[PDB]
């Protein structure tokens, strides 16, 4: 869609799976990792 959005097609095909992303994965990474900020970060090397 680099190309597609500067050509004829702005009727966007998949406009809802765009919207899935913008509006829960973006914000489920920020919460998810809002809540869990050590634990990724965490190894058993003694954070958490």
Do not use: T
């Not at 004829?8 to 900020?37: M, S, T």
């Amino acid at each position: 869609f680099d190309g597609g959005s500067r050509g004829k097609g702005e009727h966007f095909p998949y406009e809802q799976e765009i919207k899935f992303f913008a509006k829960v994965v973006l914000p489920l990474i920020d919460q998810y990792f809002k809540n869990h900020r050590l634990y990724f970060l965490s190894a058993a090397s003694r954070p958490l």
